[PDB]
Amino acid sequence: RPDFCLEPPYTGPGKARIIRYFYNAKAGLAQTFVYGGIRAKRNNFKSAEDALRTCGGA
Q1: Each residue of 14-29: b (16+ CB within 10 Å) or e?
Q2: CA triplet 32, 6, 4: central angle to 5 degrees?
Q3: Pairing of strands 29-35, 18-24
Q4: Fewer CB atoms inside 10 A, N or C side of the chain?
Q5: In 1-58, where do the E strands start and end?
Q6: Would residue 41 be called left, alpha or beta, if left means φ above 0 and alpha means ψ between -120 and 50 degrees?
Q7: Pick the CATH number of 1-58 from 3.40.50.300, 4.10.410.10, 4.10.375.10, 3.40.50.2300
């Protein structure tokens, strides 16, 4: 699994409130979180399906 997949979600320093997805490795599912619009970490997807294809595991 890529190393970032186990990291908590990162809103970042931006003031926007955009709904993104992170891989929740303990649930084994994607979850939404609020993203501030800049300086993303890599556990940050535009869709559940992208989160699972990247981080769901072989």
Answers
A1: eeeeeebbbbbeeeee
A2: 95
A3: antiparallel
A4: C
A5: 18-24, 29-35
A6: beta
A7: 4.10.410.10
